[PDB]
Structure formats: C-alpha cells, structure tokens
Amino acid sequence: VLVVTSKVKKLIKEKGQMNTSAETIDVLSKAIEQLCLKGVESAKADGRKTVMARDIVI
Amino acid sequence: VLVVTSKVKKLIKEKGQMNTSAETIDVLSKAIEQLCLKGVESAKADGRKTVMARDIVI
Description:
Chains A, B: InterPro entries: CBFA_NFYB_domain, Histone-fold. Chains A, B: Residues 7-56 form the Transcription factor CBF/NF-Y/archaeal histone domain. Chains A, B: One of its GO terms (molecular function) is protein heterodimerization activity. Chains A, B: Pfam families: CBFD_NFYB_HMF. Chains A, B: This is Transcription factor CBF/NF-Y/archaeal histone domain-containing protein. The structure is a homodimer. The two termini of chain A are 20 Å apart. Chain A has two helices and two strands; from the N terminus they run αβαβ. By secondary structure, the first copy, chain A, is mostly helical. Chain A has one domain (5-55). Chain A binds chain B through residues 1-4, 7-8, 11-12, 15-21, 23-24, 26-28, 30-37, 39-40, 43-44, 48-53, 55-56, 58, and chain B through 1-4, 7-8, 11-12, 15-21, 23-24, 26-28, 30-37, 39-40, 43-44, 48-53, 55-56, 58.
C-alpha cells in the first residue's frame, strides 16, 4: 500500500463526512504506483538519475 | 503527507535505480489529496456516504 490509509480516511471523513471503501484505498495506491513508474520513464528518457516533480504528470 | 514516502522511494529505486526528490513526494501527496476531494464530490453527487473506487477517476 503506497498511501497512508489512516490519513486518507481522515481527510475524506473530515472534509466530506464520507467513509472510505477498501477498494478506494487500492485504487489510490495503484494510481501512485503508475505515477511513479511513469516518472521513472520520464526521468530516464531525460538521462537523469532522480525522479523529479516535473516527471509526475498530473 | 498522504503517500508512504519510504515505500515510494523503495519502488522508484528498485524498479528504476532512480532516486526520488522531495518535490516528487509533495506532488504525489497533492495528487492523492485532489483525487480524494474529487471522490467526495462524486460520491456526494450520487447521494452516497462512502467514497468508492468508481469515484476515483484515474
């Protein structure tokens, strides 16, 4: 799991009075994994050894 | 911070032999915050009290 589950659930509850399903946590974690892997692609294509904010295309 | 920093850095290092900048962590966390808030919008518009995977549009 790549998201901080407790903090995600807190944000959703305090900002929306919403509960958070388990599958929501899974999708968020998968989204982080994909952003990271695309970031690696971008950084390497640029000949760099560090993934930077400009590599996280959002 | 809404991402698990240590686990993000591990993924990027093990999958890309890349380092991870601090600003990368910040962008990932901001992305999670925005996905969560959009998820609250979608769930509430549907009259629900739980943010579900279908509310996280990725």
